[PDB]
Design a binder for this molecule. Structure first.
Ligand SMILES: *[C@@H]1O[C@H](CO)[C@@H](O[C@@H]2O[C@H](CO)[C@@H](O[C@@H]3O[C@H](CO)[C@@H](O)[C@H](O)[C@@H]3O)[C@H](O)[C@H]2NC(C)=O)[C@H](O)[C@H]1NC(C)=O
Ligand SMILES: *[C@H]1O[C@H](CO)[C@@H](O)[C@H](O)[C@@H]1O
Ligand SMILES: [Cl-]
Ligand SMILES: [Cl-]
Length: 221
């Protein structure tokens, strides 16, 4: 179990819960056809009305911790329980207002993921753990400036031998991309992009040889 609950933008920590819609607990989303797959559910109120200004090309850290509280000292399952092998993924969607409550019907493009490396048997979850919950990635430099949601997700495949089984731990950050260019990427639907036939979602981790994370290929400029 894990929760994305804070952001750093080009080395500046924004603060616990700031510009993130933080779920009330670390309970997983398990239904890929639920609207809960978009940005989770049951947000801590009142939800932040901060929209983090981020230059296109800028470096963002999405901070995962074991619980919705963020860092509360030593915990062997902070940022996640390391037995919970799986990928880490980041997506953006262009939105009219990054504080708007309705997150349905958006078009999500993947900007980063950390899957599995067979030769080292290392998962993105392992790297996330080593990195103290820091999922660090850059915002594509060519993107159209404006308001976006930043969906960052940790998937535990520990029990993903059938569907339902995969456990999805995700939140949406609220960002305002500045500078940039004019690229408006093709995105996918949530729900929709993840299906019960995807070997990225239905996976026996004790029988993994190669692994491909679910969803579209990573967008690059
Ligand atoms: C995960 O990310 C956190 C949150 O940003 C990392 O902590 C931060 O690390 C930075 C960069 O090394 C520290 O910056 C330094 O600040 C000191 C003064 O406080 C200054 O003298 C240096 O010039 C430098 O800019 C920052 O202080 C620190 N912020 C925290 C701890 O809140 C953390 O290291 C990352 N964890 C892992 C395992 O990578
Ligand atoms: C954000 O900052 C990182 C270093 O923290 C760079 O690697 C990246 O190019 C971007 O400037
Ligand atoms: Cl746990
Ligand atoms: Cl460009």
């Amino acid at each position: 179990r894990t929760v994305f609950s804070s952001l750093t933008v080009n080395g500046v920590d924004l603060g616990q819960g700031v510009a993130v819609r933080v779920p009330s607990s670390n309970a997983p989303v398990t239904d890929i056809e639920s609207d809960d797959i978009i940005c989770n559910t049951g947000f801590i109120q009142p939800v932040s009305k901060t929209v983090a200004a981020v230059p296109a090309g800028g470096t963002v850290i999405a901070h995962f911790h074991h619980t919705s509280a963020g860092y509360v000292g030593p915990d062997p399952s902070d940022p996640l329980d390391p037995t919970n092998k799986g990928p880490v993924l980041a997506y953006l969607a262009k939105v009219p207002d990054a504080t708007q409550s309705d997150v349905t019907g958006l078009k999500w493009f993947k900007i980063w993921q950390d899957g599995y490396t067979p030769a080292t048997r290392q998962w993105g979850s392992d790297k996330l753990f080593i990195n103290g919950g820091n999922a660090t990635f850059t915002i594509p430099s060519c993107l159209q400036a404006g308001q976006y949601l930043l969906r960052v997700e940790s998937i535990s495949l520990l029990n993903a031998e059938q569907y339902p089984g995969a456990q999805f731990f995700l939140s949406c950050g609220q960002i305002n991309i500045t500078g940039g260019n004019k690229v408006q990427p093709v995105g996918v639907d949530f729900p929709g992009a993840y299906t019960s036939t995807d070997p990225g979602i239905v996976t026996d981790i004790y029988e993994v040889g190669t692994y491909t994370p679910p969803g579209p290929a990573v967008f690059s400029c």
